[PDB]
Amino acid sequence: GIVEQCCTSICSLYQLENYCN
C-alpha cells in the first residue's frame, strides 16, 4: 500500500496519483 511505497520507500508522483479519486 501507500505506506510501503511512500513512507518506508521513497515516494513518487506516479504512486501518489494512484490514490487520488
Partner 1 sequence: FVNQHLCGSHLVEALYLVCGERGFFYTPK
Closest distance to partner 1 from the beta carbon of 9 (Å): 7
Torsion of CA 20, 15, 12, 16, to 10 degrees: 20
**Rounded Cα–Cα distance for residues 21 and 19 (Å):** 6
Closest distance to partner 1 from the beta carbon of 7 (Å): 4
How many residues make contact with partner 1 (CB under 8 A)? 16
Contacts (CB under 8 A) with partner 1, residues 1-21: 1-3, 6-13, 16-17, 19-21
* Side-chain-facing half-sphere of 13: CA atoms under 13 Å: 0
Binding site for partner 1 (CB under 8 A): 1-3, 6-13, 16-17, 19-21
